């Protein structure tokens, strides 16, 4: 009953099971630990970062090793459009003979790989199960390096100080230039040297790379300035990927669009992209001042940025010390940027597939988009939660105020009511009218008169599609016109490739849109606005409100303030995160439902099914869920089973976890404490069991813990059931 | 970089004078015990108790390897594979083309014998109050003192004799595995070569 929460003496003195539960959930909140200083905080965070990167590299190495050992990578190379990639083998003693037979792939039961790693590794120039093994070996070596570094930087003479950790200019210069630019430069080097010849049949391994010229002229044009030579003779339109037939000699080109065979971006396009990004980031990494008297001091930049007329208060004067001294502000900024970035990855890796033969891998396309959108929602909610935490525990009004006037951040708490009221107005506006139009379509179609539907053509979005060259909406605007200056300017660089790809019905590049797209985009906007409303309200109201003008004194996460003053359930800022998680899950569900139904109709060919039935709710319920759930639920029946049996089991498992979350959310404490007391009496008053007694007094889960557990069940069930549905439906419908 | 100190003066390494002399074995033992208590206090890790137990097991296993070689040579060690219909799909190793290669029955029998011996060990582990030599160290008990580079030359059924023979057997197993890995033959093939041919005859 002691010594487990070593970091908290208050918990270690708890005589109940709450100590164990809270010991888990407070282990990473280093700022709240006993005998805590800032130096130890930054050093522990640094070591934890090292361990985390080691974990990531070990996970990647495991994926590589299992593809190399139990996969069919080599067979998939020779026939990427017919051979289904294998993730890893299965050894489960609970299998019957039927399950073994159904999951049997080649030599052993195995799982199909939906991560798209086969296409990614094939694109970057891997052709052998020994290339994957080398990658796994190297990644385990890197993990060992990172673990050694993490141990080393906790040693006495190697523990960095607060000044080093808060040295913003040095870290920015190095991160930008070194990390981004130099990693892009090295990736361009690999892309060219290995990937470009490997796509043309020439093997460039760790033996013949110092003697195989990536370009026939060989670094002469680069120093000579004849950089056009690297773009001459690109890959033809009859080039077979991985073979020298119809190949070229160029390494950096503009082509635009996709490879005619793999239906993916040109490797020479991506090498040029990464070279340009490398140059730009290396240049941008010299901005801030270091030991050589030139550069920028960001404190001065922030302080000097006050509009002269005066509408942002005193400007950004106090922001430098605010961000530097708070790890939650930086964490929130990083999480918001990462969420936007992974939303970008999801939205671009389906419209512009970058890996060979990934466009025809429909289950992996759906899985990748869903995975990245869910990660995006999680990251955004985390960014807002950490902003709220910064408000609660790191924000100092004195730093952000100069002689009564407030800086740009402190002024966000002055018109907080205006911000929240207008977020509420936008949410109500969008919800009222999107639901009104959807229900109008529902009722009108149900009454057998679909012509009375309200169908709004998304002209604004179709205008953008025409601006990028789509000649489908008869707009003749910028790139849909051959005479506009936008078209004449790039008529010789990348329009022929771009136009040939955007004006193609088999791509996902700028999918044609209609009224259903309009309505679902408005639903998405409503979801985004409502999630933002909850999170922003929790962040701004974190330090106090009218119901609790001292909420900052109770911390970020506390159960309530009691039944007084009318009742104060879910009044903390943590509860705002807890409520906004449901809205994030709902919004990501809407986004992924829209994406998956649109792409299922596109792949099956019945795009008229979406364009007609997507305007009313029953259309969704009947033609997406009810229609495509048939292959999934018949993964095992009283007659047999298929390789989709695991997905049906996961479907039911997700439903069960969802409803257990419903348990933990609807039923609150107090009802579970008295029942536990009855159980305690029963155990204490029964023979043959009195010999065994608990060391920690069994008590009901706390209010905040119960909310967390219900949210965890809700989210896990949500994710599992939707993953099972999307994967099984795609597999069982599209062969 | 220049206007500040990367490492504070208050956080600097101090040379541990407590390990002066203290040959690498004593230094390693002290470092392990200080760094990992509650597993060192149990006798686990680089400890004389663990060394003695592992030596006993290595000697018994040299005996077991000789017995296994004899059984393989003398027509024992049942033939074929396990019945998947009888023992489920967990005994299936691979399916090449329409035939299920299962775990060899000889491997199953050897695993059952090893299970017998390991069960005996587990009973002795959860029988601490009735066994002559316990597996772990009692709280308070102190680990027997390391024997050193060369244990005392005391012939017979002595602690030093068992210690020396356990070290020799463990080194022999290490050498056997190293020879098998370097040259590439089976473990029993290496033992057969190292016995002239008198085992697999």
């Amino acid at each position: 009953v002691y010594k487990f929460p070593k970091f908290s003496k208050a918990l270690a003195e708890d005589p109940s099971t709450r100590r164990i539960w809270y010991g888990i959930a407070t282990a990473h909140d280093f700022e709240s630990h006993d005998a805590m200083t800032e130096s130890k905080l930054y050093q522990k965070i640094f070591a934890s970062h090292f361990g985390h990167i080691a974990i990531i590299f070990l996970w990647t190495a495991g994926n590589l090793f299992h593809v190399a050992w139990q996969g069919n990578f080599e067979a998939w190379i020779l026939n990427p459009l017919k051979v289904r990639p294998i993730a890893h083998a299965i050894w489960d003693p609970h299998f019957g003979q039927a399950a073994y037979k159904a999951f049997l792939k080649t030599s052993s039961p195995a799982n199909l790989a939906l991560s798209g790693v086969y296409e990614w590794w094939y694109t970057i120039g891997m052709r052998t199960n020994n290339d994957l093994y080398q990658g796994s070996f190297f990644l385990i070596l890197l993990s060992s390096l990172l673990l050694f570094a993490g141990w080393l930087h906790l040693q006495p003479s190697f523990r960095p100080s607060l000044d080093w950790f808060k040295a913003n200019e040095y870290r920015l210069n190095h991160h930008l230039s070194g990390l981004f630019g130099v990693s892009s430069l090295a990736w361009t080097g690999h892309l060219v040297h290995v990937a470009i010849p490997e796509s043309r049949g020439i093997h460039v391994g760790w033996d013949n790379f110092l003697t195989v010229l990536p370009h026939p002229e060989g670094l002469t044009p680069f120093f000579s300035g004849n950089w056009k030579a690297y773009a001459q003779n690109p890959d033809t339109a009859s080039h077979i990927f991985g073979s020298g037939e119809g190949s070229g000699t160029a390494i950096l080109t503009f082509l635009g669009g996709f490879h005619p065979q793999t239906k993916s971006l040109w490797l020479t396009d991506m090498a040029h992209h990464h070279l340009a990004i490398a140059v730009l980031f290396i240049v941008a990494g010299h901005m801030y001042r270091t030991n050589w008297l030139i550069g920028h001091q960001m404190k001065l930049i922030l302080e000097a940025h006050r509009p002269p007329g005066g509408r942002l208060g005193i400007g950004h004067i106090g922001l430098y010390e605010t961000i530097t001294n708070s790890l939650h502000f930086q964490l929130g900024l990083a999480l918001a940027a990462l969420g936007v970035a992974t939303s970008l990855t999801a939205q671009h890796m389906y419209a512009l597939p970058p890996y060979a033969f990934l466009a025809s891998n429909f289950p992996t396309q759906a899985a990748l988009y869903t995975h990245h959108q869910y990660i995006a929602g999680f990251l955004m909610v985390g960014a807002f939660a950490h902003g709220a935490i910064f408000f609660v525990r790191d924000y100092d009004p004195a730093v952000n105020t100069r002689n009564g006037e407030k800086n740009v951040l402190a002024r966000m708490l002055e018109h907080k009511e205006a911000i929240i009221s207008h977020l509420s107005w936008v949410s109500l506006f969008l919800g009222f009218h999107t639901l009104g139009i959807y229900v109008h379509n529902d009722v009108v179609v149900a009454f057998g008169q679909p012509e009375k539907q309200i169908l709004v053509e998304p002209l604004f979005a179709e205008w953008i599609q025409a601006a990028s060259g789509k000649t489908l909406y008869n707009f003749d605007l910028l790139l849909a016109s051959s005479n506009s200056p936008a078209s004449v300017a790039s008529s010789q660089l990348w329009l022929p490739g771009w136009l040939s790809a955007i004006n193609d019905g088999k791509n996902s590049l700028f999918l044609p849109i209609g009224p259903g797209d309009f309505l679902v985009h408005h639903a998405i906007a409503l979801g985004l606005h409502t999630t933002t409303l909850i999170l922003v309200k929790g962040a701004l109201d974190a330090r106090g409100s009218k119901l609790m003008p001292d909420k900052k004194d109770f911390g970020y996460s506390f159960p309530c303030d009691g039944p007084g003053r009318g009742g104060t359930c879910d009044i903390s800022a943590w509860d705002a995160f807890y409520l906004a998680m449901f809205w994030m899950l709902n919004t990501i569900g809407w986004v992924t439902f829209y994406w998956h139904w649109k792409h299922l109709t596109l792949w099956q060919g019945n795009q008229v099914q979406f364009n007609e039935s997507s305007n009313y709710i029953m259309g969704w319920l009947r033609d997406y869920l009810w229609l495509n759930s048939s292959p999934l639920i018949n993964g095992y029946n009283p007659f047999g089973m298929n390789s989709l049996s695991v997905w049906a089991w996961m479907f039911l498992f997700g439903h069960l976890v969802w409803a257990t979350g419903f348990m933990f959310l609807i039923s609150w404490r107090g009802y579970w404490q008295e029942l536990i007391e009855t159980i305690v009496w029963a155990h204490e008053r029964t023979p043959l069991a009195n010999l065994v007694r608990w060391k920690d007094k069994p008590v009901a889960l706390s209010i905040v813990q119960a909310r967390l557990v219900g949210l965890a069940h809700f989210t896990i069930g949500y994710v599992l059931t939707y993953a099972a549905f999307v994967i099984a439906s795609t597999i069982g419908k599209l062969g | 970089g220049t206007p500040f100190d990367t490492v504070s003066k208050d956080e600097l390494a101090v040379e541990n004078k407590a390990m002066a002399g203290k040959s690498v074995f004593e230094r390693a033992m002290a470092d392990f015990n200080g760094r990992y208590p509650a597993v060192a206090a149990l006798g686990l890790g680089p400890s004389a108790k663990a060394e003695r137990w592992n030596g006993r097991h290595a000697m018994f296993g040299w005996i077991v390897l000789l017995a296994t070689g004899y059984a393989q040579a003398h027509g024992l060690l049942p033939e074929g594979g396990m019945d998947a219909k009888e023992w489920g799909t967990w005994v299936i190793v691979s399916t090449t083309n329409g035939e299920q290669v299962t775990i060899p029955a000889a491997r199953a029998a050897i695993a059952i014998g090893h299970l017998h011996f390991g069960a005996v060990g587990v009973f002795a582990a959860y029988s601490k109050n009735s066994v002559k030599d316990r597996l772990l160290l009692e709280p308070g008990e102190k680990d027997e003192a390391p024997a050193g580079l060369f244990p005392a030359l005391r012939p017979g059924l002595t602690k030093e004799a068992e210690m020396l023979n356990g070290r020799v057997a463990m080194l022999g197993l290490v050498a056997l595995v190293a020879v098998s890995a370097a040259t590439g033959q089976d473990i029993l093939s290496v033992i057969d070569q190292g016995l002239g041919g008198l085992l697999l005859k």
């Binding site: 010594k3 070593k6 070591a47 050992w69 050694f148 906790l154 | 760094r35």
Partner: peptide, 30 residues
């Protein structure tokens, strides 16, 4: 198909990465 030697040494290297992980884990304290 990878050999027994390839998998074995990868397992051995994985063990070394494990001992480095507990050293980091124990250094981040109990």
């Amino acid at each position: 198909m990878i050999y027994d030697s390839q998998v074995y040494i990868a397992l051995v290297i994985a063990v070394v990465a494990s001992v480095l992980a507990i050293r980091l884990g124990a250094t981040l304290y109990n």
